[PDB]
Ligand binder design. Structure first.
Ligand SMILES: Nc1ccnc(-c2ccccc2)c1
Lengths: 367, 367
């Protein structure tokens, strides 16, 4: 008999790493062709984004299946650990096979490989469940559609950590100035190179800040949750999938815009991405409020002490993004500045969210 | 009052991601120049490896400092969460600053940036501890040099997951055949492209298998540990640092060798890397046996039921790597085949480790 907490955490980390692979090309796509070749570049970017979304959804489905399989198996063992490692190895091939299918649909080989991989995952799961059943003491006490809070929390943390640090990873990978390049192009001055590369640092700053605040809201929301239903899991997975686009949005926004209208469009895209990312969390919290009796703790129940605080925490980002999106069309002159100042305002509001909520209560109550 | 388990897990994931950044160039270095330019390529690879080791050690030190800081702080809050996010953001800049220092030592700016970043991390930690002290109820109950098992386990799992899936990440990133390339170069046949790219798949297979078995041994060892001392933490960090070289070793080994002696040298390098990775785990287990009374559970005590099983689990890899390294010089003709068959033999022994240990006991007892 062995505890499965560490094993399940490792499996969640592996699944989170695998799910977030196809984002890497998307962030590595050239910023601007500079030769007004927008057509092909946009088509390639759209295809990559669609492929990434599809693989993320498929890996999420596989992760949910694994979570259920190990939920019906209470305990673990060395043989079960080896079988879990094998299952993770088989699952890891899904993104590459899906990409091979998508880019080369005409050939009948990619679909064959995908079917083989799915059948292999099924076989590993069948072997795991059979081994567990052959030994009754390794099964769950009850047996021997709620989800598990720990698995969802670990997957969300892994996804958020991967998304937040992507830009810094790329910067460390490729944004190290070369000696002779600095000597010749920039008159042998490092400060010039740092100034040139600053926009990437600003984009990383913004992306990391936004992702960190979103993760903080996610953690605050999930702390006060007792039971996680399948609908909440689906909404959380959708929110995580839409979160992966934040680095791309910030890279596009921070990049120099040829014309002001291009900057307005980039800000609109970033605002839409943020709104989509946060509205799913809001919707999942409403789905939890639907039956707090079986979902939330008494503290965050209707009329609770922290009910309004949680409302504000989960509505700060959606509402602000909506106002920014509206201003992008209402004023159309300070929209870029509005987004820039909002990027610094939202963290301040989150830090002072308690005092701001108290002031809002004081002013609305006697208004 | 809020629980810090999720927050500490997220911090550990971020720190593990940051620590394992500089490995990415190392695995992305060109396999063979093909123009007998071994000098410059080898110098660049050695410099990259040294930089990676240094950054990993520095990030490990920072992670240990953070672990102590949050150990003296029992509970967390929204303000503490924001401060932790800020501290992680400041820490994330360490690898890039260290690289800037190393590549450009002559200029006095990289050292200034590194000092500024270290001072910033110190300032964030000071602010965190001051805020915690200002509110007594947020401090640890005892206050209001053992380590934490959970933090070490999470960091190890993150590092292992990152290392294992690096090769598949690269394959998905860059190893997707192009339509016209297949049409023209390979006579429009996808099977030819897959056969050409197979060596990378084999290298990923080997690396993932080895890393997974090493992680399984790590989990089995750490399950039976009550208290983790600083020496065990240092040994585990050294083992993790040396584990990061496995993908590079497997990439070099699977790559076509110009001459047989090159293949022998590559196998020697891979065997040495594996031996270094596993000997540190063995040494840390011996350091735990030093005072099992305060370190291990009674089950794995001297003369315990699982003592010999754990001995075999932790000595299978070191001993086998030592025999392979010896054979690389003794026979010098089947060394490559010896390594290839060992790669498949070791997982089988691990799977049947219980039965193999029983047979070994039966044969040694009455021998
Ligand atoms: N996608 C990742 C990358 C690195 N680490 C993790 C992780 C680590 C510990 C617990 C949960 C998740 C996830």
């Amino acid at each position: 008999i062995q505890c499965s907490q560490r094993m399940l955490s490792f499996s969640d980390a592996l699944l989170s790493i695998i799910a977030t692979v196809m984002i890497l090309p998307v962030t590595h796509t050239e910023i601007s062709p500079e030769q007004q070749f927008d057509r092909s570049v946009q088509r390639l970017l759209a295809t990559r984004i669609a492929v990434y979304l599809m693989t993320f959804l498929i890996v999420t489905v596989a992760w949910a299946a694994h979570t259920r399989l190990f939920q019906v198996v209470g305990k673990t063992d060395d043989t079960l650990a080896l079988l879990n490692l094998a299952c993770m190895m088989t699952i890891t091939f899904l993104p590459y096979t899906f990409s091979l299918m998508v880019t080369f649909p005409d050939v009948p080989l990619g679909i064959f490989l995908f079917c083989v991989c799915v059948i292999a995952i099924g076989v590993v799961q069948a072997l795991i469940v059979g081994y567990a059943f052959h030994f009754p003491h390794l099964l769950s006490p009850q047996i021997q559609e709620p989800l598990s809070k720990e698995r969802v929390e670990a997957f969300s943390d892994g996804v958020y950590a991967i998304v937040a640090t992507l830009l810094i990873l790329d910067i460390c990978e490729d944004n190290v100035p070369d000696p002779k390049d600095v000597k010749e192009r920039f008159s042998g001055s490092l400060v010039a190179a740092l100034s040139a590369t600053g926009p990437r640092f600003l984009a990383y700053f913004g992306s990391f800040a936004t992702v960190g605040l979103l993760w903080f809201a996610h953690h605050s929301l999930f702390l006060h949750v007792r039971k996680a239903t399948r609908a909440m899991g689906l909404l959380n997975t959708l929110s995580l999938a839409f979160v992966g686009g934040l680095p791309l949005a910030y890279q596009q926004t921070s990049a120099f815009a040829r014309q002001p209208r291009d900057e307005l469009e980039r800000v609109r895209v970033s605002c839409t991405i943020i709104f989509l990312a946060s509205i799913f969390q809001l919707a999942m919290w409403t789905t939890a409020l639907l039956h707090q009796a079986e979902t939330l703790q008494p503290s965050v129940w209707f009329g609770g002490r922290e009910h309004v605080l949680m409302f504000a925490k989960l509505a700060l980002y959606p509402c602000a993004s909506l106002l920014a999106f509206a201003s992008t069309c209402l004023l159309s002159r300070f929209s870029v500045g509005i987004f820039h100042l909002m990027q610094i305002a939202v963290p301040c509001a989150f830090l002072l969210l308690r005092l701001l909520v108290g002031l809002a209560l004081a002013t609305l109550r006697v208004l």
